[PDB]
Design a protein around this ligand. Structure first.
Ligand code: BCL
Ligand SMILES: CC[C@H]1c2cc3[nH]c4c(c3C)C(=O)[C@H](C(=O)OC)c4c3nc(cc4[nH]c(cc(n2)[C@@H]1C)c(C(C)=O)c4C)[C@@H](C)[C@@H]3CCC(=O)OC/C=C(/C)CCC[C@H](C)CCC[C@H](C)CCCC(C)C
Ligand SMILES: CC[C@H]1c2cc3[nH]c4c(c3C)C(=O)[C@H](C(=O)OC)c4c3nc(cc4[nH]c(cc(n2)[C@@H]1C)c(C(C)=O)c4C)[C@@H](C)[C@@H]3CCC(=O)OC/C=C(\C)CCC[C@H](C)CCC[C@H](C)CCCC(C)C
Ligand SMILES: CC[C@H]1c2cc3[nH]c4c(c3C)C(=O)[C@H](C(=O)OC)c4c3nc(cc4[nH]c(cc(n2)[C@@H]1C)c(C(C)=O)c4C)[C@@H](C)[C@@H]3CCC(=O)OC/C=C(\C)CCC[C@H](C)CCC[C@H](C)CCCC(C)C
Ligand SMILES: CCCCCCCC/C=C\CCCCCCCC(=O)O[C@H](COC(=O)CCCCCCCCCCCCCCCCC)COP(=O)(O)OC[C@@H](O)CO
Ligand SMILES: CCCCCCCC/C=C\CCCCCCCC(=O)O[C@H](COC(=O)CCCCCCCCCCCCCCCCC)COP(=O)(O)OC[C@@H](O)CO
Ligand SMILES: CCCCCCCC/C=C\CCCCCCCC(=O)O[C@H](COC(=O)CCCCCCCCCCCCCCCCC)COP(=O)(O)OC[C@@H](O)CO
Ligand SMILES: COC(C)(C)C(=O)C/C=C(\C)CC/C=C(\C)CC/C=C(\C)CCCC/C(C)=C/CCC(C)CC/C=C(\C)CCC=C(C)C
Ligand SMILES: COC(C)(C)C(=O)C/C=C(\C)CC/C=C(\C)CC/C=C(\C)CCCC/C(C)=C/CCC(C)CC/C=C(\C)CCC=C(C)C
Ligand SMILES: COC(C)(C)C(=O)C/C=C(\C)CC/C=C(\C)CC/C=C(\C)CCCC/C(C)=C/CCC(C)CC/C=C(\C)CCC=C(C)C
Ligand SMILES: COC(C)(C)C(=O)C/C=C(\C)CC/C=C(\C)CC/C=C(\C)CCCC/C(C)=C/CCC(C)CC/C=C(\C)CCC=C(C)C
Ligand SMILES: COC(C)(C)C(=O)C/C=C(\C)CC/C=C(\C)CC/C=C(\C)CCCC/C(C)=C\CCC(C)CC/C=C(\C)CCC=C(C)C
Ligand SMILES: [Fe+3]
Lengths: 325, 44, 51, 273, 255, 76, 51, 51, 44, 51, 44, 51, 51
């Protein structure tokens, strides 16, 4: 068969790239030192490093490591400082949010005080990484699309951890820090408030998540099929249209009746991805504060199906007949 | 004389005559069918 | 009116005819299906009842 | 109507079957042999869905429900009102999907492109055939498929997961969810980077790939590149759909108990004191 | 919590507000993707009667680098081909076209190229982006099999020449083209092959798209040290057209 | 030398299969034996693709390269 | 039952008499302090896994 | 007013005509369906009651 | 004169007269239907 | 009514014939299945009952 | 003369003649089948 | 007030006309639907109670 | 009726014969399977029952 372009046939290596610069002097804060990995180079670039160190990144790293160690040390102390048991039950341990009886006041350190101190350090860390993403575009003289897309996910992060507990009146509404314990929180949250399937904004979030994954399968596949015409050099195709863009557009035009442009497909991708956490956060913010049972809400608004048949195994079979006796 | 489709006035008249002639037969058949249906199961 | 024939100086007949055919078939199917969803006008069931 | 640059690409040839008997266009759409089979199958399926809706008694799009048969019918054919219409519609849908893929293949052949898109669509066809043909055949009855209803195919999902108590603890479902979330984070990053390169602040010049590579090594210390990102996105999406099919086909025919209990092998490993 | 009227509460208001916003967003997204290829035309080159339900967008300007000027879109089609050797197979619209002469030499069908700028693409420093390896300071093969010196085999099983050099993109550190020296029996001079159309093995390099007799008509670059965008498009389209035009059995139904 | 790396990864896969069957004869269950088999594969096959495939062929070439690295240092 | 759900069930439910129901019986209610939360729902889920 | 015709110096007739053609049918279908959801104006049930 | 579409004054006048004729005919048919329906089953 | 042949000055027979060929067979298959899905007009069940 | 397909006046009349002759052979067969079905199992 | 005509020196009439038409129809539909949700102003239900 | 040969002036026989063969075989297989899906017309069950 013809070459498919998933793995590079032959690799070439030269002097390491140190990056572009302008009057903002980005070189002063960049680390010196690079590496090369030939295992990764079969798929993408092989160069590793360098990285930029500002104050936002340093503060984010320090405060995020603090959160990690308060959780990790609390988990270790819960087990009696037993390392083999610590390893055995790693997926099951967690740092639990406070009890409902304390409201929005400060709880005892044994019952959620360490959870609140660690939550304040994770908050600070996340907002600092976002200020770094905005500053680097400003310093690079580019648009701020990356920062906006990151703030879209930060919106749902803050709704889950900060806004909804305050509007509900209890710190006990927050998510625990654990692997399995956080999945139990998801199931219990869905059960407690009826059925989360019948929340319309949950359905919209699912729509946009499905749409975003369908679009990277379509966009990745389309770009890999026009790489024999230079289609992976997208910016120059935007500035000077070539045959790769024409064939890529005509494929979808002949397939489903409409198509996009080289620049305009990325706007579609940006919006579908961004719309998932926005609708998700709007849906989460309305639960408990407005609607308490989503299935009864669906029955009220007439989109709940009805079934005619009966319930029970003996309406369909017999216990002896299911055993072969 | 405005024209987006490239047709002339005379061509448009000739086309419209046949279009209306073919539209009247469809209506006559539908009227007969509706009369037969009303005689079997009235609805008013 | 006498000037309605000028509608073909704006719309192309080739697209209009296809659209009208699709619309007419869909409307006929919708009505024939709506009649079958009732009890008084379902002729398949009426033929069974007068059996 | 054609685009300004489309006429020179509309040539004859490149069909798998049919020759020039179906080699033409209707509006923007291309038709071939597989365009005639797609139209037939899809129209028959939709008309049968609406006839079933008329016989059910409601035309509300939220409440239409066409369901598979009872388990007592096994792998045989049921009466058309008690679940046979579902079987016919399933056959029609399989035919329509396969015809769509084979039509994309012919369009690719005519344009002189690679065949990546039909191959990617084959993965989604495989996840659907696992849900309505493979798991039901293995489990022994067609009644294990999900119903065709906008709000009734979510009830099926809910009941099928609680039939294994706590579905989050399924090992292959955890891999599939991770793949989904990673594809969305990578799509967001790629779109943002390209748009920020092509749309600078007012009064500035546009940027090139060097600038994009630099921003990402400054941000996180690594850059996959302009060619690697598309390979990685495709691989992530295809891995997401493959692992989804696995998570469902093991839940029924391979495992019967709750999914948390499956983790017991880790909890009682002989090394632990 | 209370309702405003009937069953209308805060969730319903939020849902309808999102409905309106999403309709406006769909309008914006569809309008943004109409900056190339419009207005629509018929199969005779005239403006079509139908232009669709969405109007065209207003204008945007791009300020290009290295003093190349400004680009305003939507605008006139500057990449349009002038004299295409094609013939209609029907009197109306919706039917295919037939080549008048040699489709591979005339650049039609899957061999079509777009009239791009006649200058090479530049990197950040203002230098040509794709350079032969024999002039690229510091570059070497770090992994894989080196194809230099291996013979090249065509799609029908003929040896046409030897690989002499490789052309690389130095900014992204990637091989873009392979340079082939032809034997006198199969032509004269040097030709280029894009990397995505070859399979490099241990003893040979395989190009399946075209046959041996097609290797003399591959377009040739003007300078031996740089290639412009127009030449790139004509070279890549020539190889792409062979997947359909190399043999008469590739064009007929496979059945 | 990507062909020696793939060979070394395959000897790791084969050692993993053998680790599963051996623990099962001694009393362990399949999944317990297969977790240990996966680690044997990844640790040992990885180690052998660094060590064995990194003893690349060169003979007096190896010597001079090393004696010249020993000249870089000395003035570094 | 191989989960991280509370191991407090079977003692508050089958030895003492605590409420197992957690659901609100209206689409919109005014939430008061002392009403069931998701923490109680997890204990009920542990009891149901035991069942 | 006597100068309403100048609306065609602002809007393109083709796009307006297509939009109005869609809008009128959708409005008529909506009204005909709203009448069928009441008790006093559903003619299909009225025909069965008087049969 | 101001013109965003490309037509002239005379073309706009001629188009508007033919549009108004069809609008009045449609309204008359609707009026007759509404009066018959009111007679059959009055509202208000 | 005598000028209907002019329809072939608008539409090419090659497209129209394949559209009609798809449409006719689709209709036939549907009516046979709508008939096969009733009690009164299923001719396979009638032969079993009348036997 | 208006012609989007390129056919002349006589070619269209020939094609129409043959088309309408197959419409009558299909309609007659359908009518006989419907008569037999109605005699077998009436529906009105 | 005499100088309100200069609003067309700021806004493009083609955009404003489309926006105004959509806004007006949507507002009228919302008001008509809000009236039908009450009991004292629902004319379909008023007609039934007066017969 | 005597001019039906002209169908070969519109459609190429080479591409028509293959499609006709595929259609005929698929239709025959579908009908045989539909007969096998019943009780009265399943000839494999009848031989077992009769003997
Ligand atoms: C019993 C289970 C319930 C259920 C309960 C819930 C609950 C509860 C929630 C979801 C939510 C979601 N559900 Mg649900 N859901 C169910 C069934 C499903 C099914 C299905 C059956 O197929 C699907 C496809 C989904 C899918 C989804 C997603 C569409 C959505 C999450 C949005 C998002 O952006 O996620 C991606 C996640 C994020 C963006 C989180 C933000 C991450 C932040 C930004 C990370 C910061 C950095 C970090 C701290 C640093 C780490 C360290 C680094 C290495 C340095 N659900 C059933 C009904 N679902 C959520 C939602 O929005 O509801 C509307 C939600 O809260
Ligand atoms: C969602 C995307 C994730 C991501 C990816 C990512 N980051 C990366 C990489 C990748 C794929 C690297 O390969 C590169 C690296 O070298 O890591 C060790 C790196 C990196 N990301 C970093 C930072 C970083 N990334 C972050 C985020 C993320 N990056 C996400 C988790 C963050 C936070 C908190 O958001 C931070 C602070 C550094 C740990 C590192 C910066 C690279 C650097 O400084 O390289 C210096 C060069 C070297 C000499 C070190 C290379 C090691 C070897 C001695 C070189 C020889 C190569 C060998 C053959 C293979 C080993 C390499 C392996 C990584 C395969
Ligand atoms: C639009 C919604 C989608 C989205 C988008 C998105 N996420 C983003 C962004 C965007 C646009 C960023 O710009 C930002 C980023 O930096 O991306 C590379 C990011 C990001 N999204 C992340 C996570 C994440 N996003 C998620 C979701 C999503 N994000 C959605 C799918 C999810 C989930 C649950 O699905 C997760 C888990 C991070 C990788 C990153 C945010 C980085 C950040 O804020 O980091 C704070 C850092 C610390 C905690 C301090 C460091 C302490 C560490 C515990 C250890 C040391 C660091 C080390 C490098 C890691 C360990 C590796 C070792 C080998 C060294
Ligand atoms: C990695 C796998 C991802 C993927 C890939 C994928 N899908 C694809 C492609 C690719 C690469 C295409 O090229 C192709 C395309 O053309 O996209 C525009 C497509 C496509 N995938 C689509 C949708 C889709 N993809 C989905 C998901 C995914 N597809 C994955 C995330 C989903 C969901 C549920 O998440 C949906 C809904 C289509 C828009 C499109 C082309 C399918 C198509 O048009 O098929 C022809 C059929 C018809 C026009 C109608 C058929 C009618 C039937 C006979 C009757 C209907 C019966 C049906 C079963 C009822 C279901 C009721 C529900 C309420 C349950
Ligand atoms: C109700 C109507 C649909 C029928 C109901 C069943 C199907 C429902 C599912 C999907 C509908 C998709 C239908 C799209 C078909 C398009 C056909 C086509 O081709 O139409 C084009 C016109 O269309 C377009 O230009 C693209 C339209 C958008 C595509 C779909 C977007 C899906 C976005 C989000 C996901 C959707 C989920 C919902 C989120 C709910 C949110 C609350 C004619 O050609 P054109 O040349 O492009 O004209 C334009 C220009 O050029 C003028 O010149
Ligand atoms: C074959 C068997 C079919 C299979 C049967 C299965 C049934 C369902 C499958 C498909 C349904 C789609 C059918 C529509 C396709 C029409 C064909 C087409 O598009 O034909 C074009 C003609 O255009 C049109 O007819 C325009 C269509 C308008 C689309 C609406 C836009 C939004 C729509 C949606 C938004 C979604 C948001 C949420 C939704 C909720 C809210 C809607 C020829 O184009 P042309 O001559 O090249 O040029 C002209 C061009 O520019 C534009 O006029
Ligand atoms: C709640 C959702 C309901 C379901 C989905 C439909 C609504 C979604 C939106 C749009 C659907 C597509 C309809 C609009 C596009 C059609 C193409 C079109 O307009 O074609 C025109 C011909 O038409 C007209 O002149 C307008 C009249 C349209 C009337 C049909 C309404 C369809 C209405 C509904 C569907 C079928 C009903 C019949 C079955 C019953 C229900 C089961 C050719 O002229 P042209 O060359 O295009 O003009 C050039 C111009 O473009 C320059 O710019
Ligand atoms: C009860 O409530 C519900 C919602 C359920 C409803 O049922 C509501 C229903 C409606 C609101 C329904 C509304 C329906 C309509 C508005 C229907 C309108 C239908 C038409 C206007 C149909 C017109 C058909 C016209 C035809 C077929 C005319 C002519 C065709 C031809 C003449 C073909 C021949 C053409 C030739 C030869 C032209 C060539 C001429 C040359 C000169 C070359
Ligand atoms: C009860 O509470 C709830 C929430 C339910 C409410 O209902 C609250 C509601 C509100 C708060 C409502 C608020 C409503 C408004 C603010 C409404 C405003 C309405 C208008 C300003 C309407 C303006 C209408 C104008 C019209 C119809 C103009 C038409 C003009 C033409 C037809 C002329 C066209 C122009 C031409 C031809 C220009 C000439 C061209 C040349 C080239 C010379
Ligand atoms: C009760 O509460 C609810 C919400 C349920 C409601 O039902 C509320 C409903 C509403 C609020 C409804 C509101 C409805 C409207 C405002 C409707 C308005 C409708 C119109 C203005 C319709 C106008 C139609 C006009 C037509 C059809 C006119 C002419 C057409 C033609 C003449 C066609 C021929 C054209 C030609 C030949 C062009 C000439 C060409 C030349 C070149 C000269
Ligand atoms: C119960 O209600 C439901 C919904 C279930 C329904 O079933 C509703 C159903 C409908 C609404 C159905 C509607 C059905 C129709 C509108 C049907 C229309 C059918 C036709 C118009 C059929 C036409 C058939 C025509 C044929 C067969 C013509 C010609 C055949 C030939 C072989 C002619 C050959 C021609 C040649 C050789 C031309 C060569 C000439 C040269 C000069 C080269
Ligand atoms: C001991 O061993 C060492 C030293 C190696 C360790 O350190 C080991 C460490 C570990 C093994 C750590 C393991 C950690 C985990 C398994 C962590 C899992 C974490 C999560 C799943 C976290 C989810 C967090 C949050 C969620 C889901 C949503 C929202 C949260 C927030 C918005 C939090 C922000 C909180 C705020 C704003 C409140 C602050 C309070 C104020 C008063 C300002
Ligand atoms: Fe891209």
């Amino acid at each position: 068969p013809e070459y498919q372009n998933i793995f590079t046939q032959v690799q070439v290596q030269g002097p390491a790239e140190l990056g572009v610069d302008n009057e903002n002097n980005l070189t002063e804060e960049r680390t010196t030192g690079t590496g090369f990995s030939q295992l990764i180079g079969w798929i993408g670039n092989a160069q590793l490093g360098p990285i930029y160190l500002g104050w936002f990144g340093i503060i984010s790293l320090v405060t995020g490591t603090l959160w990690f160690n308060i959780v990790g040390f609390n988990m270790l102390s819960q087990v009696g400082y037993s390392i083999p048991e610590f390893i055995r039950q790693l997926f099951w341990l967690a740092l639990e949010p406070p009890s409902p009886e304390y409201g929005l006041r400060m709880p005892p350190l044994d019952d959620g005080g360490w959870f609140i101190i660690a939550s304040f350090f994770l908050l600070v860390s996340v907002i600092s990484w976002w200020l770094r993403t905005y500053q680097l575009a400003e310093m690079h003289k580019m648009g701020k699309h990356v920062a906006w897309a990151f703030a879209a996910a930060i919106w749902l992060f803050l709704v889950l951890g900060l806004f909804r507990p305050i509007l509900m009146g209890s710190w006990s509404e927050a998510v625990p820090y654990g692997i399995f314990p956080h999945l139990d929180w998801t199931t219990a949250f869905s059960i407690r408030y009826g059925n989360l399937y019948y929340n319309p904004f949950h359905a919209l979030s699912i729509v946009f998540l499905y749409g975003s994954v369908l679009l990277f399968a379509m966009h990745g596949a389309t770009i890999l099929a026009v790489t024999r015409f230079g289609g992976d050099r997208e910016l120059e195709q935007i500035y000077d249209r070539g045959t790769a863009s024409e064939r890529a557009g005509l494929f979808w035009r002949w397939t489903m009746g409409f198509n996009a442009t080289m620049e305009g497909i990325h706007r579609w991708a940006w919006w579908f991805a961004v719309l998932t956490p926005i609708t998700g956060g709007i849906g989460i913010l309305l639960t408990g504060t407005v609607v308490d049972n989503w299935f009864l809400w669906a029955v009220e608004h007439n989109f709940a199906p009805d079934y005619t048949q009966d319930y029970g195994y003996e309406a369909y079979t017999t216990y002896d007949g299911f055993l072969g006796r | 004389d405005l024209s987006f489709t490239g047709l002339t006035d005379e061509q448009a008249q000739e086309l419209h005559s046949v279009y209306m002639s073919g539209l009247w037969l469809f209506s006559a058949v539908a009227v007969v069918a509706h009369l037969a249906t009303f005689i079997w199961r009235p609805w008013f | 009116m006498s000037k309605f024939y000028k509608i073909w100086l704006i719309f192309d007949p080739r697209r209009v005819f296809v659209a009208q055919g699709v619309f007419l078939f869909l409307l006929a199917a919708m009505i024939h299906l709506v009649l079958l969803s009732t009890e008084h006008f379902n002729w398949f069931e009426l033929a069974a009842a007068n059996a | 109507a054609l685009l300004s640059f489309e006429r020179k690409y509309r040539v004859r040839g490149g069909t798998l079957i049919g020759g020039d008997l179906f080699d033409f266009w209707v509006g923007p759409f291309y038709v071939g042999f597989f365009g005639v089979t797609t139209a037939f199958f899809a129209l028959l399926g939709t008309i049968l869905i609406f006839w079933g809706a008329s016989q059910q008694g409601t035309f509300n799009p939220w409440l239409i429900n066409i369901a598979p048969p009872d388990l007592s019918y096994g792998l045989g054919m049921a009466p058309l009102m008690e679940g046979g219409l579902w079987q016919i519609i399933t056959i029609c849908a399989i035919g329509a999907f396969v015809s769509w893929a084979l039509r994309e293949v012919e369009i690719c052949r005519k344009l002189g492109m690679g065949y990546h898109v039909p191959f990617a669509f084959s993965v989604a066809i495989f996840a659907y055939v696992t849900l309505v043909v493979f798991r039901p055949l293995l489990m022994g009855a067609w009644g294990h498929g999900f119903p065709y209803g906008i709000w009734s195919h979510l009830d099926w999902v809910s009941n099928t997961g609680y039939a294994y108590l706590h579905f989050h603890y399924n090992p292959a479902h955890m891999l599939a969810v991770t793949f989904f979330f990673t594809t969305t984070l990578a799509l967001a990053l790629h779109g943002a980077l390209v748009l920020s390169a092509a749309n600078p602040p007012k009064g500035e010049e546009v940027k090139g790939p060097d600038n994009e590579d630099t921003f990402f090594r400054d941000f996180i210390g690594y850059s996959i590149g302009t060619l690697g990102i598309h390979r990685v996105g495709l691989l992530l999406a295809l891995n997401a759909g493959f692992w989804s099919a696995v998570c469902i086909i093991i839940s029924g025919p391979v495992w019967t108990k709750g999914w948390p209990e499956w983790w017991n092998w880790w909890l009682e490993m002989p090394i632990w004191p | 919590e209370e309702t405003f009227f009937g069953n209308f509460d805060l969730a319903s208001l939020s849902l309808w507000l999102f409905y309106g916003f999403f309709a406006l967003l769909i309008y914006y997204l569809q309008t943004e993707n109409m900056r190339e290829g419009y207005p629509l035309e018929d199969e005779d080159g005239n403006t079509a009667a139908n232009q669709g339900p969405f109007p065209l967008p207003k204008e945007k300007t791009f300020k290009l680098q290295h003093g190349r000027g400004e680009l305003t879109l939507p605008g006139e089609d500057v990449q349009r081909r002038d004299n295409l050797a094609l013939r209609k197979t029907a009197h109306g619209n919706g039917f295919p076209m037939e080549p008048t002469g040699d489709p591979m030499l005339d650049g039609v069908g899957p061999a079509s190229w777009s009239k791009r700028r006649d200058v090479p693409e530049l990197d950040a420093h203002g230098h040509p982006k794709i350079v032969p390896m024999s002039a690229a300071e510091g570059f070497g093969v770090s992994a894989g099999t080196d194809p230099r010196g291996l013979p090249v085999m065509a799609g029908d099983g003929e040896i046409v020449g030897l690989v002499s050099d490789m052309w690389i993109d130095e900014a992204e550190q990637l091989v873009r083209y392979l340079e082939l020296e032809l034997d006198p029996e199969w032509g004269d001079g040097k030709r280029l092959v894009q990397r995505q159309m070859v399979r490099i093995k241990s003893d040979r390099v395989k190009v399946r798209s075209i046959y041996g007799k097609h290797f003399k008509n591959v377009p040739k670059t003007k300078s031996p040290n740089q290639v412009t965008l127009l030449e790139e498009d004509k070279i890549m389209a020539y190889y792409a057209g062979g997947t359909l035009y190399a043999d008469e059995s590739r064009l007929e139904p496979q059945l | 030398d990507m062909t020696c790396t793939i060979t070394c990864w395959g000897i790791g896969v084969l050692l993993g299969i053998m680790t599963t069957v051996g623990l099962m004869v001694v009393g362990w269950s399949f999944l317990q034996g297969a977790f240990m088999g996966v680690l044997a594969w990844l640790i040992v096959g990885g180690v052998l693709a660094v060590a064995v495939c990194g003893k690349d062929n060169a003979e007096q070439i190896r010597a001079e390269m090393a004696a010249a690295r020993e000249r870089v240092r000395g003035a570094t | 039952q191989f989960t991280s759900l509370p191991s407090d069930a079977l003692y508050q439910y089958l030895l003492n008499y605590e409420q197992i129901a957690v659901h609100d019986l209206e689409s919109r209610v005014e939430t008061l302090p002392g009403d069931p939360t998701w923490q109680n729902t997890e204990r009920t889920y542990s009891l149901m896994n035991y069942f």
